[PDB]
Each structure stands twice: as structure tokens, then as C-alpha cells.
Amino acid sequence: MDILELSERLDLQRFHSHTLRLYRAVCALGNNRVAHALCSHVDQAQLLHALEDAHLPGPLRAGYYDLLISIHLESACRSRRSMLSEYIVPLTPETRAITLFPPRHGLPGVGVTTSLRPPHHFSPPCFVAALPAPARLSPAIPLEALRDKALRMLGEAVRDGGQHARDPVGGSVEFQFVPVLKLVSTLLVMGIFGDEDVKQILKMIEPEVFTEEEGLLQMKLPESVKLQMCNLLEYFCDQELQHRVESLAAFAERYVDKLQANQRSRYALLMRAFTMSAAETARRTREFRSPPQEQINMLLHFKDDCPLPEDIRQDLQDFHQDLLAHCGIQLPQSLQELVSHMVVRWAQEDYVQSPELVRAMFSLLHRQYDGLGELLRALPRAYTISPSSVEDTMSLLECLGQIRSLLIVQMGPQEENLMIQSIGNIMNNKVFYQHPNLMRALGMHETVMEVMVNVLGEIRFPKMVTSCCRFLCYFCRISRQNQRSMFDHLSYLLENSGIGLGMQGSTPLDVAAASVIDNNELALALQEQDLEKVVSYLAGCGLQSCPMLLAKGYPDIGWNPCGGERYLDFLRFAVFVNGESVEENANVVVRLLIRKPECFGPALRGEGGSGLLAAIEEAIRISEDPARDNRVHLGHAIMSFYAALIDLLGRCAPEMHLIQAGKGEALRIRAILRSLVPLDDLVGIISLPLQIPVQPKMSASFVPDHKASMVLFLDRVYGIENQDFLLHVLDVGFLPDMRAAASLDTATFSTTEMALALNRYLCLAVLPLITKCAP
Amino acid sequence: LVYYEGGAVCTHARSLWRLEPLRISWSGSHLRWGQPLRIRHVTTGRYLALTEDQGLVVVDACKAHTKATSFCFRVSKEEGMGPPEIKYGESLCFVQHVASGLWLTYAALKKKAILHQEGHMDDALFLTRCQQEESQAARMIHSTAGLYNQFIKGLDSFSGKPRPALPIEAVILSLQDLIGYFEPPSEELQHEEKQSKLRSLRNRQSLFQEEGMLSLVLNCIDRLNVYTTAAHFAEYAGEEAAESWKEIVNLLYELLASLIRGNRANCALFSTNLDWVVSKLDRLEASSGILEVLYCVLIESPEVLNIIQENHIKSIISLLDKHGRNHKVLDVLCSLCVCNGVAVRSNQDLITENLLPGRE
Amino acid sequence: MADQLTEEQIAEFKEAFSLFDKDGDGTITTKALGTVMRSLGQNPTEAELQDMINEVGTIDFPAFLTMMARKMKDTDSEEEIREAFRVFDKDGNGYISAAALRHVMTNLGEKLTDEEVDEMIREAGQVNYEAFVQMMTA
Amino acid sequence: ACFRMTPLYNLPTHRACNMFLESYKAAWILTEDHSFEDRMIDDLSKAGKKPDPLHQLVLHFSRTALTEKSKLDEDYLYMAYADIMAKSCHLEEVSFEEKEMEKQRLLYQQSRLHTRGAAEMVLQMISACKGETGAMVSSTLKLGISILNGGNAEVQQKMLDYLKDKKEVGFFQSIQALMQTCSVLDLNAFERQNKAEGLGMVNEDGTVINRQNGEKVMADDEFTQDLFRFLQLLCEGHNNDFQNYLRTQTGNTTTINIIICTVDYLLRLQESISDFYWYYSGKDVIEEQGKRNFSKAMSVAKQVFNSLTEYIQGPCTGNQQSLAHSRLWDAVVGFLHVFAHMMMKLAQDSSQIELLKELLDLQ
Amino acid sequence: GVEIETISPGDGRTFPKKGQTCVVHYTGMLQNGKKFDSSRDRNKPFKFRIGKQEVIKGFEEGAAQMSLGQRAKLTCTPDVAYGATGHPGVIPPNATLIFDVELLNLE
């Protein structure tokens, strides 16, 4: 039966409309393979004929238009809308040709803009190709006849509405205007329409204001088409703002060229000076020794000293006046006035009861009446890139779009593999390393953490989590500003990493640890709640063993040292910075550890009273027997946990100058640390020898780094001042290791990694200590 | 057992308590100190007493002596409306058994309650009021639970025993009136009134979910849907019950659909019992109710969608193929693909690879 | 912190790695890493390279980037001493006096205090430029 | 490292443009004073029955706030429009006629909003916060203080009418929770802030934003001042109805003593300021870094004391009796002790006369 | 295999040579008689190079047996074409495909 016959047949029309809805839903939010399947089910020509049809029912026509957009334009439109907010304008020769005013406002949305946007990727549908994972592209449309055909339908609908027919296409004015305007708005967002098409669309929008029939805003409209009109005006205003930003960047390039020439001239003049004064040389030193941000701040201060000639100041004032004139400050014939009057009239004529239309209309109203505020808000996302890195920046932007496309997709094998490939690609690009400000402005960290939280919320896909954590750690290591930005979400990350995954590789707790390192400001800004959560996790770590360890066949005990080792490492990183201890965080760490005795090992508990030396001896005995304990060995786990606890206690000790000053807090903390662990335990642990090479199992062996933590404790909290004490401890623990290293220095045992580890021990844990107390 | 739990249990129906004075005439007088009154649980209907069997243990109304279940109120340790008043929220009170005289305090956050002679200084309790909706819902929970337990016991009495009387009329009336009770608000009301009604409905559904009525409804409907056809139920039960069986099952499906309409917790509860719904989907009698149940579950809880595998999708396709061209199945299929802005790739692939390729 | 390196150095590192990145996965062998280092002209010792590799086969672009930054920190510090020597006195020929300290404190860029300048001078007309620079470097 | 800072001309243009953009947006367009709220509020309220665009906007915000949700999303549009409306009525010897004319102008500019339904929207959205701080609730409090500025009478009557008609209890719970969270001067934090301030103002190879990061102690000073000003303007004008309603609400299921909670916050602030004085008891002089924090705490104490006064003002027996039976006496004794010692410590020196003036004003 | 049922005559001399580009207008048809793919609907010739594995085996083998200007009906067995797994949601498993293809040019 004819598709037009469904007008009387209500049930079949309803079923077909919901079938189109299902077709859209299955091919919604990406899934280009399903889009190809729908292209098999619905041909390119069939869709085109239905779009131009006039007798088709309203719901069927709307469903067909929505199907076409959802299977042919949806993914590219989404990517372009994502890119619409980031302004990356290279300093191309075309960029420098951008003028704020035409050589009155020009037509919005027409002209040339050099803002860097990724191109669209399309694949023609051919369904006899050999069956072959690559990210399959969305289906392909001619996209050239579509432009003129959409313009033709828009013009025909405007003419028909002017004719005031009683039989509108689709049965209502809404079904005639809303879908075609949705298609036109999406095509404008995509940017396919050229200068002539944009000019014709502007003329159709308003015939009098935008002139270089009857206007479409002038005629009466219902709310549904008003929503699409509001979207269209929003897109046009966004284009105008983008043009303003591009012109501002062009003037920025011109003015910085002038300013750097003037600064070099001033440097030459200052160097030529011989006997000016004791202050003129001071002025030159202040201007030339300050950081470049400070210098550009001093030179740009001539408002309301400033070593700048009046010519450049007058030029900047002229540009400032031009920009204020463009914003509409003036301190209908233009876009701002037209949109404002249309919004006001729309609100006055009727009491609109659709919340989305009200929200969008008032959003435009605020955007138009506050242009300077909108420009100020949009400026942080703007950036300037050199013309020589445009290809690499385009690749980076394509990768960012790809990774952003996974924000609204449930995680699976193919998606996580493609996510890992994107992470590898963004690693291999050099722009990510050259410009950290650009990397933060695009804000890949936010969406990467969003994906990490989405997958985390047993955690599946562990490799992608590990690569995500590695990317976050490297982004922290890139720059200090990025370190601050990541630390701003430290509590969020710790909440995500409340329970250690235990998988090999990086963990979100490692991301947190790398987020605050080698920076005194972040450590001083470390709030109480994060440390309290960490110590609470450590305390809960002492009550039960690791479920993974139990499921791995390991003997069951009352706690899991492996789980707490990561928390001890994070605390150690958060206490000790730049070869120094921060008093404020050390105080908190000591008090929070001492409030809950369960944080310490069961041996150090007051009830059991096993003792640290006895605990380590029992650990060595357990490691001796394989039955009692890659595959993590329980003896090494307990040994490493106790070593990490000792290291945290030592690195948390007060600084020597604080002790010499006699401040009460430092003395009290040193006393409580001395009371916690006796010196006899330290000397006994140092007394314990280590197997030397037939090399022992390195993972299960007595690592010298345990003694490194022990000697760090000995050097920091107690110290060596008595001749008898130094001689005794030295004889008991220190000489045999040096003799063993000297014996192992032979070529046959020189290459052994046990010798290398013990060498790193001697030279970086004990030898400086012996050097310090040499006298 | 009687606990002193705090948190989400405060808003649930189990926290509600009723105070019934011993005297019947003028029982609505203000609560004066030392007045002999009883305390009963509004939902279970049991009566709290200090029985010698387990100390503080709540007991059924069949055995609750006055000397064993009476209670008194004292400010300190030491007809008509009558005495003025004791304040709500600002006046403290100490619970005390009338005969034993032992103070009420925590024995030991599921801390048990025992009547130790020493008690505690912080054992005082201050009273707060509950609105009409909570009390009405709790008493309805009590009545419906009793009636439904009697009905399910009668059902289990003759299980697998081909041949009292099941209260079919009372059960059917209860289902109809509960359907009327859980009716969604109409869209014609203004935003304020509609939002207030929706919030009240959500609170009522949460109270029913916490009270455990949903599990009992599942048990009843599972027991009733074991049988296949009305003649089969006629064989086991009789003609009179067989006549009403269709109405009972239809109303039970309707109530199950209504109890999980819009609330995320109720539909997320079905994250493990989805296979039951999918298996019982294919039944001929009472199909619209189970279809509506599945649609509500799929649209309300995003976490439910990840559980579905290929067999459930194939069963839905079978329903579409065997029950004509109805748009409700197709709406269910559409809701399967997308949930609140996130797309499930696996189920989309299964849908596009099961129904579409066949072209039939 | 990778911000120490200049864009020219990072471009040179990218080109050097791409010279041996024909695979495209980014993995570079330890011998390949040594060859890349030799191409960079560093010619590091085998023991030092092995220790650096073991500290952090599986060498990728970010790892070699961090290693090169750690290596070039030493060159930056080597130039820092000459920069400090030439900045303590512009002429650098016996021009050490309290006037230089006052000029430095007035326009240090970090807004130093007079008492702080006096303390720095005490750390150590007549003055020693090299000793003052060493005291400033602590 | 400051000596080895590279000059501007050696840097490439692609980054010099970046810092030029940063300096321009920081120093030139941000300081441009654009007064356009009045024009917007005049255009939207002209009405050219069908409500005017301003009434529709207020209704849309009320609808958004009334929607049930776990927490209201930070709506950029609502916060922006709320400021536009708020600054509009804030502002556009002196003789009696001029002062009366200015007051009448202020009442007209407030009537441009409170007859559209601004008070109901403000109460709805402050009640829907469920007791959580933020920038949006701060903007709501800004709008509230702007509407209630000058002790307007009809606005308070409309607020009372709506609050009694709705009989909602979450509004006072939200106020109680918000006041509970308000911070008080903390010695430990100040210590961290001043230790951080001792670091260099220039980081290695880049500027340091530690000064621009803001103080960590008394961060919510503006929020606390605005909340207490809103409360005192709510009870401004000797409105006995609110003076009896705030202490105890008869209609609502649960009564929350806002006045007692305010006294508790005042006591917490007293304890904090006494600890802060004890920290500066030994020192001969007062540093400016601590002086600024002391002045901020002094202003907060002044605001809360003015709020308490405005509660007390008028022959309200219930509030007076409730405050006589609270812990305000111990707080007042602690204030008297710390104030006396502070006056003597400041009088010992002569370079901190402004802090003494603030001390005397709060006294 | 494939059975070339000559629908229309074509120039006999011209035949496909390995390494040459072939432009075709195929109108795919499922075994049951339903239509799934049509190049003429897209209005774009399906350019493909003969001798490679870009195109399915049956269509390539038939194109080897085609001639310029000739029309034919090439039924393809399931083993030859998309055997036992089909393009998702396009071709059902173990179903034959029928193609209506005529050549435009060989260059």
C-alpha cells in the first residue's frame, strides 16, 4: 500500500512511527555499524524522496527526518558541537587578515575563520566488501545536494506559510517547520553551508535587518518551532563570538610584535646607558629580571610605571574602543538588537508554558545583553598555536574527539581497546608535551577521570584503568599547574580509590600520590579530610586479610600488608617533600596514626606485644618455608609493610632546627616516636644479615630497602651522638654489609642485581649517615 | 529482637510505634506521667513486653498480660483531656516497666535493648510526631500483610492435591483499592500540587518496599502463576476460584507494575530477578500486565539493562512475533537501547542482529 | 617536571625517537634506547643507562622523555653557575659591595626584604661576589 | 632562579600571544564597568492577564527549584539572572526630602520584583538546597538581602504568608545546616596559610598564584555575613510576627530554634577568637597577615551581634526569655575577657589604631 | 560457484584484466526476493579493483566472467558469499544472494 495511504490507517501509522523510533534508538549515540545496517534497511534515495514529499503524515515525516539525521549526521554533529567551545586559532597569514570591523556590523556567521577544527570522516556504504578492530566510520551522504535541497525546502515552506494555506505539510505548521528547521540547524552546526548559503539563510531569517517576502520571525509561530529558532539564533551568536575572538587574537599578534620590537629597542637603549642613576639601573633590572608574565603585566598597565610610547598605547586604546563598539556597549539594525527585540516580543505576546523554550530564550537574552561577559567567560578556553604544529594539533583534536565520544557509551572490550589506542596516540603526540596550558584548556583530564569513574563504579577492564592512571600520572608530572588542577580532585580520586584494586600497574591511589609530590604548596594545602580518609582505610586494612590473597590460595591471616603498603607509600609521599618534612602534615599524620592503634601492625599492638624484631624474624621464618607462604609472598608482604611503616615514621620526624629551637610540639612528637619503637628493635633489624649470591628469589628475599627504612628512622628520630652507641650499632649491623659488598664487587658477581640493590642501599641510606657523623 | 538502629531505619515503617492506654473510655487524653499504657508495633501488630523468656521481646496479641505488658513514664529516675501536656521534641521521658520497674537502656549499630537495673544516664527518649500518611500506610501494611499471608497459606494448603475457601472477594477488593491508592497523579494539576503528590507517592512506595510487601506480592503471584489455565486451577481449587483467577492475576500484575512505577530502588531490586519476568513474559493470559511491568523496570533502572543477555532479547523478539504488531513491545525495545543518555553497545548489537536481519 | 625543557629540545627528542619509531607502537629496546641516546650525542655509560632503565624492553616516548629531562637538569644546573656569576656583578670584575646587595633586594622580582637581604649577606663596602653567590645558592 | 628568568623578546610569538591574552583579560576587560542590569530589568518589566517576561522568568526559576531532586544543579543561568535582578535594586548633608525620595525609589525598585513573586522563588530555592553550601545559594542570599534591603514590610508579610501556607519544614532545616557549616577563625589553618605565604611569590620558571589563591581561614566570610544580614533584615522593622515565628513554629511538625543556633555559632566564634588571642598573647606586636584575619573575624562578629540585636529589638518577651536562658552569658563573659586584653595589647602599641577602632566599634 | 544468466547482450571482446578498475551498478537482491542493497539508489558507481580481496569472492569471480555492456543474474551460494556469518543486520546466515549488475566502463 502507498506510504501516503497510512493517513487513514491509524494503527499501521503508529506502528511505523514507533518502528522509526526503534531504528533511531538502535543507531543512537554512535554505533556506526548499526548505522550501516539501517542504511541497508533504509536506502539513501528512499530517505531523500520522503523528505521532499508533501502528502506524508506528520509523525511519519518527523520520524523520517529524525532517522536521516540520526544515521547520517548525528556523530559528526556531536563532535563539531563538542569542538564549538574550544577556540584554537593558529597564527596563519589568514588569521592576521581578520578585522574586527569590515573595511556597522557585518552579516553574522559569514566570512573567514581560521579556528582549528577537525575534518569530518565518512565512509561510503558498500555491502559486498569482504568480511574482515578498526573504528568503522559513519555512513556517507552526498552532502552537497543536501545543502541546496534543505535551502529549497526552507524557502518553499516560508512561501507556503506566507500563502496561509489551510492544509500545511504534515497536517500542522509544527510538522512542517520544526523538522526541516532542525535539519537546517544541524547543517549549520556542522558548518557545511557556505558563504552564499549562510547569506541566503540570513535573508530568510530577516529580510530587512540583514539585507545587504515576509520574514520567518515576523510571522506567527507556535512554541515548538520557536525552540528551533532559538537554537538557530544561539548558533549565530556563537559564530559572532568566535569571529570576535579570532579578531582579538589577530590584534594580539600585531600588538605583541610591536611590543617585542619596542622592548628590544628599550634593552639596547638601557645597555647603551653608562651613568644614568642608581634607580634607572634598578628599573631596568626589575623590568628585565622579572618572569615574562610579570613583565607583560607591567607593560600592560596604562589604564586609569609604563615605559611605553604613546603610539602603541593609542593603538591599543583604538582596538579597545573598537571591541567595546562591537560588543554593543555603545559607550533594529544589528544581530543583538534584533534577537533581543524578538525575545522580548515573544515573551510579551503569550505566556509560554514550555520550560525548555523559556530556558533557551532567556539564555539568549542574557548572552545578547551581556556580550563582554560572554567574551570574558569564553576567553579562558581560547588559545594560540604556532602555524608549524597545525597537523599535530589536528591529530590531537581528533584523538580528543574520539576519547570524548566514549563519555556516553557503556564500557566494553572493543571500546576499552579503542580507548587504549587513543591514549597511546595522545602519548605519542608532541603537542601534549609542548603546551600544557592548551592541554588543560581542552580539559582531557576531566573526561578521562569521568571515564575512569564510570568504569570503576569487581572492577572490570583492568588494563584500561591502569593506562588511564598512567595517563593521569604523566599529566600531573607534565606541569605544576596541571598538578594543581589534578590535586583539586584529590578527595574525589581517593573516594574512587577507597579500596585498592590490587591489579598490576598504576592505581588511582598512585595517581593521588603523584598528584601531590615535589611541591610544598600542595602539601601545605593538603586538607584534614583526605588524610583522615587515608588513615581510616589503613585502619580498616588491619582488621581483615585481602580477598584476592585468600582467593589466590595464600594462607589466611588477620590482615593484608599488601593493601596497606600503598597507603603507607601515599602517606610517605604526602609527608616528605623536597628533602624536608612539613610540620603541619607531620603533626596530623602522627596524631591520626596514633588515634587508631589498628593502623599499626598486629605485632606493635599493646595487647599482643609481639615486637617488631620478633615479627621480622617470624616473617623471615615464614619466607623460609614455601608452604607457609607475579605471585606475592606473604613474608615479603609483611616485611615491606613494616618497612614502609618505619619509613613513614622516620620521614615524619621533626626537623633538627625545630628540635634545637626547643618548640614543644617537635619535642613531644620525637618523644612519642621514641616511645612507639625502641632502639633495640632498630639495632636488631639492622643486625639481621641478607642472603648474597645462585641468586635468591628477589621478590621473597630480604630486600636491603627494609634496612634503608630502618637506617632512615635511626638517623632521623634517634640519631647517633655517643661514641659507644655509634661503635656498637656500626659493628653489629653496618660493617658486615660493606664487607659483603666488597666481596661481591668481583666481576662474576658484579652484574648480579642483588649486588646492585645492596650497593644502592649502602651509597644512599648509610654512607651519607657515616659521612655526616664522621667527626 | 528490638534494636536502637539509627539512620535510614528512622524513615521506614518499622520505626513507628503506637501507644494505647489501658482504659478504653477517654483513651485520647493527654499522656500524663505514670499513666499505665501499652506499646505495640503498628506494622507487625505484636505487643512489646518484658517477658521472662528473653527479657525485652515483643509478643503477639494472643498473650499479653496487663502486669507483663504495661508501661509507665517518669521524668526522672527518683476523665476528659485531664492533665495538660508533655512536649513533643523538647520534653524527655524514661521508659519503665510497670511491674518490674527496670529502666530501658541499650544492652551493649544494631545494639540490643535490655532492661538493666542500672540503666544509663543517656537512656532518656524524646518524642516526635508522625503525620497521617505514615500511620495510614503502616496500618494498611499490617492489614494487607495479614490478609495476603492468609491467602498464600490457603493457596499452599492444596498445592499438588487434586480434589476452607479462599477469600477471593476480599483479595480482589484489596487489589483494586490498592491500585486506586497507588494511582499516579494526573498531568493536569499545576507543578506544585503535582510535585507534592508525586513526592507523597514516592514516600508511600518506599514505605511499602521497606515493609517487604513487594517480596510477598512476588511470592503470591509466583504461586498463582504455577498453574497454566483456569481449568487447571478449577481442578485443584474449584469452579468458584477458577472464575476469579483471571481477575486475581490481572490485578496482581497491575499492583506489581504500580509499586515500581518511577522509583529507582524498587526497579533496581529486580536486578537479580529479571530472568523470572522474562520467563513469565511468554504467558498468554495476563500479558499486558507483565509487559507493562517489564517496560517500567527497563525505563526506570539503568543498572537493570546491563544484566540482559541474548536469550532475553530473543524472548522479546518471540513475544513480538507471537503477539501481533503492538507498539508496547517496540517501545520496550527502544528503551532497551538507550538509558538516560548512555548507550549500551552489546544490547544494541543483539537487537540489530536478531529482528532486523530476518526481514520477516 | 617536564616543563624545564624548551620546545626546541622536546622537538629534537620527538625527532630522535621517530627516527627509531618505525614500528609505531612506541616501544623501544634498551639497545635501541642506547642508540637513540648516542644519536642525541650524550653517549652515557652502560651502567648508568641500565640503572636509569631499571629505575623506571618496554621503553616508550614518555619514559625516555622523563629520562632526558632528568639528564638535562644537570646541563641546566651547569649553566646556572655561570648565570649566577655573571648576574652577581654585571661587569664581574671585583664589583662586590653593599650597593649591589641593595640593588638586588630592590629589584629581585620576589619582593625581598631589607632584613632578609641583611641575613643573606651575613650568611656569606668590601664583599666577595663568589661567596655571596654561593650563600644565595646555599 | 629569578636571575635566570628569560626576557619577553626571546620567547616565541605563539606563547607571547598567550600571555598577552591572559594579561588583557585579567587587567582591561575585567575592570570595565558595564552597568546594564537596570536596562534589562526595565525592558523585561514593561509588559508592553498575561504575565510580563520578568514574572515568567521568576515562575520558571520557581518551577526549576520546586522539582524534586537529590541536589539542585549549579545552574549558570539562574545564578547570573539572580545577580542581574539583585544589583538592579541595590542602587539604581542630605535633606529630608532627598532621603525620602531615595527611599521611595528603593521601595519602587523592590516592588518591581516582590510583586512578581521574587520572595516565593527565593524561599523555594533556599529551602530546596537541603542544607548545602555553594555559589548558587550565595547568589540566592544576595538576591534575598537585596530584596529585603532597607527593612521592607510588604516583602516580609508575603514571605510569612507563603511560608505558613506551604507549611514546609525543610527551609529551616536548610538554614540550620548552612549555619552549622559556617567556618570560624581557625588557628591551625591560619598557621598553614602563613607558612605557605612565606614561600617565594615566584615559582621556578613561572609566576606563583599563592597570593591569588586566597586565604584558607575564614573563607566563607562573605557567605556568613550575607546569611546573617539576610536573617537580620528578615526580622528588620520590629516585626513581632517573625520574632515569635523564628523561635518556634507552631504549624510545622518540628520546631527549630534559629535563635539558639545563632547563639551557638556566636559561642563557637568567641572560642575561636579567644584561642586566636591566646596565640598572640606572647607576641609584642601584631603582624598584618594576622591583623587582616582578625579584622575579618571582627566584622563577622559585628554582623552576628547586629543580627542578634535586631532579633531582640522590640518588646518581644519570648525571644528575650529564650535568650536569657541560653548559653549567651558564658559567651559574653568570654568576649569581655578577650576584648579587655585586646584593648590593652593594642594600647601598648601605636601602629595598629585601625584595629583598635574596629575593636571599639564591635564593643 | 556462480551461474551467469545473461540478461542483456554486451560487447564480447572487452573482458576484465587483472589490475584494472571496474565500475558496476549492482542491484542486490536477497534469496527470498527481498532487496537489501542497490548501488543505483546511491547514484554512485561501485568502483573496485579486480584481483584484490576488497570485494566478496563470488562477486569478484562473476566480474571476472562478465563483459562490457552485459547484464546478468549471479546467484551466489552461501559458502561463497558471507557464509554462516553475515553483515550484522543485513544478510541472514547461510542465505544466497542474487545480484543484477551491468558494467559501465573498464578503465
Numbering used by the authors:
A (entry chain A): 1648 to 1750, 1759 to 1787, 1794 to 1873, 1923 to 2014, 2020 to 2046, 2091 to 2216, 2222 to 2393, 2414 to 2477, ...
B (entry chain A): 244 to 321, 332 to 361, 372 to 426, 434 to 630
C (entry chain C): 1 to 56, 62 to 129, 135 to 148
D (entry chain A): 3634 to 3681, 3693 to 3736, 3750 to 4020
E (entry chain B): 1 to 107
What does the report in the manuscript say about this coordinate set?
RyRs form massive (~2.2 MDa) channels that are embedded within the membranes of the endoplasmic or sarcoplasmic reticulum (SR), where they control the release of Ca2+. They form homotetrameric assemblies, with the bulk of the protein exposed in the cytosol. Calcins are a family of scorpion-derived peptides that can penetrate cell membranes and bind to Ryanodine Receptors (RyRs) with high affinity and specificity. Upon engaging the RyR, calcins cause long-lived subconductance states, which are readily detected in single-channel recordings as decreased current levels at 20 to 60% of the full conductance.
The 22–30 loop in IpCa contains a consensus motif (RRXS/T) for PKA phosphorylation at residue Thr26. Addition of a phosphate group would lead to substantial clashes and thus preclude binding. To obtain a good reference structure, we collected and solved a structure of RyR1 in the same conditions as the IpCa-bound dataset but lacking any bound calcin (see section below), which also displayed an open pore. Thus, the combined cryo-EM and functional assays show that phosphorylation of IpCa by PKA effectively neutralizes the calcin, and in a cellular milieu, its potency would depend on the relative activity of PKA and phosphatases.
